[PDB]
């Protein structure tokens, strides 16, 4: 575990910076695939994984990687903050400032994020009993991030997208 303040701050910065590069490259990979450049998309995804390794290395160096129940709890805390504090305020500020796209993106998140913390809660209860959760698949709306395990609505409650649009994790 890194203990010195500046170095710790620097690793935290580098974690956020590699998180954002990894993310950009993922977003850029999708765009490349769409514009008909599949080897470029593969390039972005490979380098996106390189940045995952760097962020993960920094993360583990800060001592932030624990066992699954502890990791689920960091996630519960993170999700709670996003949905109880950050998105409600950001949404309100976008509305107050008349920023319509930002009203959209924060609105989607505000309605799509709630379930996360709940799902991590359940998971942690079963993982601390030394068991896995009993889930089959998870549906994610590609438009607004709406999230459902096992069963899902015929249309996304957030954006109206049909279930056939949903990304399935199984």
CB nearer to Fe ion: give 44 or 145.
145
CB of 154 to a second copy, least distance (A): 19
CB nearer to a second copy: give 44 or 154.
44
User: DSSP per residue over the chain, as a string?
Assistant: ----HHHHHHHHHHHHHHHHHHHHHHHHHHHHHHTT-HHHHHHHHHHHHHHHHHHHHHHHHTT----HHHHHHHHHHHHHIIIIIIHHHHHHHHHHTT-HHHHHHHHHHHHHSHHHHHHHHHHHHHHHTT-------EEE-TTT--EEES---SB-TTT--BGGGSEEE-
Residues in contact with a second copy, shown as a per-residue x/- string from 55 to 94 under the rule CB under 8 A? xxxxx-x--xx-xx--xx-xx--xx--x---xx--x--xx
- When binding is defined by CB under 8 A, the residue of 84, 97, 125, 150 that contacts a second copy is 97
Contacting positions for Fe ion (CB under 5 A): 141, 143-144, 146, 156, 158-159, 161
């Amino acid at each position: 575990v890194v203990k010195r303040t500046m170095t710790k701050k620097f690793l935290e910065e580098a974690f956020a910076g590699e998180s954002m590069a990894h993310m950009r490259y993922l977003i850029f990979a999708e765009k490349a695939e769409q514009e008909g450049f599949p080897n470029i998309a593969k390039l972005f995804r490979a380098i996106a994984y390189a940045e995952f390794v760097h962020a993960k290395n920094h993360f583990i160096a800060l001592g932030k990687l624990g066992k699954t129940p502890e990791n689920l709890q960091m996630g519960i805390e993170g999700e709670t903050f996003e949905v109880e504090e950050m998105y409600p305020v950001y949404n309100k500020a976008a509305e107050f400032q008349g920023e319509k796209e930002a009203v959209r993106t924060t609105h989607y998140a505000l309605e799509a994020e709630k379930i996360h913390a709940e799902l991590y809660r359940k998971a942690k209860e079963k993982a601390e009993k030394g068991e896995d959760i009993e889930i089959k698949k998870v549906y994610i709306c590609p438009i607004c991030g709406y999230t459902a395990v096992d069963e899902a609505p015929e249309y996304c409650p957030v954006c109206g997208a049909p279930k056939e649009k949903f990304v399935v994790f199984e």
